[PDB]
Structure formats: C-alpha cells, structure tokens
C-alpha cells in the first residue's frame, strides 16, 4: 500500500524472517540468532566491525524502535552483509543470508507497493 503503518509492517517482516522454512524444512534464521562473541572469534571480527543478530533485532522491536521500515531494512542489511563478509559462498550461512535477505525484500515490497 502507499500508506502503511511502519510499526505494523516491521513486526510482520521480523515475523517473516523468524518463521520461514525453506523447502527442506530448515528454519534458516537459526543461523542468525546470536552473533559470535567478540572475545571468542578473532577471525570473524577481522572482517566484521559492527555485529548484529536476531536477539538484538527482537529487543529493538520490543522497545518499539522500528517506526520506519528503513531502520529495520538497515539492520537486516547489516545482519546479512556481516554473515557474507566472513562466510564464503558455499557455506550454509552465506546461502541462508542471501535467501532471507531476498525474502525480506520481497515481503517488504508487497507491504509497501503502490
């Protein structure tokens, strides 16, 4: 719709990512629940400067911080870009990042289309 309620749309988009299974029945978001701890993953933090995960995004959602769809988009962009920065194209993480990002955008586009 051209006239949307961002708080509502952001809740739906989070739920989309939270609940999605691929055709193999894999709950792809499970790979993104927790980012590696800084003090336990020096290789990851050589290539990732600002970590984020679904725990953080869920907390922000609960705190009502997503009142602009662009803010949620930026957080998922970071979430998936960080994964693609460390993990290589053949990895489950990279593949799931590409798939969930594309799902995010497609779902978003249906909510905010003219």
CSV table of C-alpha atoms in Angstrom, one decimal:
chain,number,residue,atom,x,y,z
A,1,UNK,CA,0.0,0.0,0.0
A,2,UNK,CA,1.2,3.6,-0.5
A,3,UNK,CA,0.0,4.3,3.1
A,4,UNK,CA,1.5,2.0,5.6
A,5,UNK,CA,2.0,1.8,9.4
A,6,UNK,CA,5.7,1.1,9.8
A,7,UNK,CA,5.4,-0.3,13.3
A,8,UNK,CA,3.0,-2.9,12.0
A,9,UNK,CA,5.0,-3.7,8.8
A,10,UNK,CA,8.2,-4.1,10.8
A,11,UNK,CA,6.5,-6.6,13.1
A,12,UNK,CA,5.3,-8.6,10.1
A,13,UNK,CA,8.7,-8.5,8.4
A,14,UNK,CA,10.5,-9.7,11.6
A,15,UNK,CA,7.9,-12.5,12.0
A,16,UNK,CA,8.5,-13.4,8.3
A,17,UNK,CA,12.2,-14.0,8.9
A,18,UNK,CA,11.6,-15.7,12.3
A,19,UNK,CA,9.1,-18.2,10.9
A,20,UNK,CA,10.3,-19.0,7.4
A,21,UNK,CA,11.3,-22.5,6.5
A,22,UNK,CA,12.9,-23.4,3.2
A,23,UNK,CA,11.7,-26.3,1.1
A,24,UNK,CA,14.0,-28.7,3.1
A,25,UNK,CA,12.1,-27.6,6.3
A,26,UNK,CA,15.1,-25.7,7.6
A,27,UNK,CA,14.4,-22.8,9.9
A,28,UNK,CA,17.0,-20.6,8.2
A,29,UNK,CA,17.0,-17.8,10.9
A,30,UNK,CA,18.5,-20.2,13.4
A,31,UNK,CA,22.0,-19.4,11.9
A,32,UNK,CA,21.4,-15.7,12.8
A,33,UNK,CA,20.1,-15.8,16.4
A,34,UNK,CA,23.4,-15.0,18.0
A,35,UNK,CA,26.5,-13.3,16.6
A,36,UNK,CA,29.8,-14.6,17.6
A,37,UNK,CA,31.2,-13.2,20.9
A,38,UNK,CA,34.0,-10.7,20.3
A,39,UNK,CA,36.2,-12.3,22.8
A,40,UNK,CA,35.7,-15.8,21.2
A,41,UNK,CA,36.1,-15.2,17.4
A,42,UNK,CA,39.1,-13.2,16.3
A,43,UNK,CA,38.7,-14.3,12.6
A,44,UNK,CA,35.2,-13.1,12.4
A,45,UNK,CA,36.0,-9.7,13.9
A,46,UNK,CA,38.9,-9.2,11.5
A,47,UNK,CA,36.1,-8.7,8.8
A,48,UNK,CA,33.1,-7.6,10.8
A,49,UNK,CA,33.1,-4.3,12.6
A,50,UNK,CA,29.5,-4.0,13.9
A,51,UNK,CA,27.9,-7.2,14.9
A,52,UNK,CA,24.1,-7.7,15.0
A,53,UNK,CA,21.8,-10.7,15.4
A,54,UNK,CA,18.1,-11.6,15.8
A,55,UNK,CA,18.4,-11.3,19.6
A,56,UNK,CA,19.3,-7.6,19.1
A,57,UNK,CA,16.7,-7.0,16.4
A,58,UNK,CA,14.0,-8.7,18.5
A,59,UNK,CA,15.0,-6.5,21.5
A,60,UNK,CA,14.8,-3.3,19.4
A,61,UNK,CA,11.4,-4.4,18.1
A,62,UNK,CA,10.1,-4.9,21.6
A,63,UNK,CA,11.5,-1.5,22.6
A,64,UNK,CA,9.4,0.0,19.7
A,65,UNK,CA,12.5,1.3,17.8
A,66,UNK,CA,11.3,0.2,14.4
A,67,UNK,CA,8.9,3.0,13.5
A,68,UNK,CA,10.4,3.5,10.0
A,69,UNK,CA,10.8,0.4,7.7
A,70,UNK,CA,14.2,1.8,6.5
A,71,UNK,CA,15.6,1.3,10.1
A,72,UNK,CA,14.6,-2.4,10.0
A,73,UNK,CA,16.0,-2.7,6.5
A,74,UNK,CA,19.3,-1.3,7.6
A,75,UNK,CA,19.6,-3.7,10.5
A,76,UNK,CA,18.8,-6.8,8.3
A,77,UNK,CA,21.2,-5.4,5.6
A,78,UNK,CA,23.9,-5.4,8.3
A,79,UNK,CA,23.0,-8.8,9.7
A,80,UNK,CA,23.2,-10.5,6.3
A,81,UNK,CA,26.2,-8.5,5.0
A,82,UNK,CA,28.2,-9.3,8.1
A,83,UNK,CA,27.5,-13.0,7.5
A,84,UNK,CA,28.5,-12.8,3.8
A,85,UNK,CA,31.7,-10.9,4.9
A,86,UNK,CA,33.1,-13.8,6.9
A,87,UNK,CA,31.4,-16.9,5.5
A,88,UNK,CA,32.0,-18.0,1.9
A,89,UNK,CA,29.5,-18.7,-0.9
A,90,UNK,CA,29.4,-22.5,-0.4
A,91,UNK,CA,28.5,-22.1,3.3
A,92,UNK,CA,25.1,-22.6,4.9
A,93,UNK,CA,25.4,-19.1,6.4
A,94,UNK,CA,26.1,-17.3,3.1
A,95,UNK,CA,23.3,-19.2,1.3
A,96,UNK,CA,20.8,-18.6,4.1
A,97,UNK,CA,21.8,-14.9,4.2
A,98,UNK,CA,21.1,-14.4,0.5
A,99,UNK,CA,17.8,-16.3,0.8
A,100,UNK,CA,16.5,-14.5,3.9
A,101,UNK,CA,17.6,-11.1,2.5
A,102,UNK,CA,15.8,-11.7,-0.7
A,103,UNK,CA,12.7,-13.0,1.2
A,104,UNK,CA,12.9,-9.8,3.4
A,105,UNK,CA,12.9,-7.5,0.4
A,106,UNK,CA,10.2,-9.4,-1.5
A,107,UNK,CA,7.9,-9.4,1.6
A,108,UNK,CA,8.7,-5.7,2.3
A,109,UNK,CA,7.9,-4.8,-1.3
A,110,UNK,CA,4.4,-6.4,-1.2
A,111,UNK,CA,3.7,-4.4,2.0
A,112,UNK,CA,4.9,-1.1,0.7
A,113,UNK,CA,3.9,-1.4,-3.1
A,114,UNK,CA,1.8,1.4,-4.6
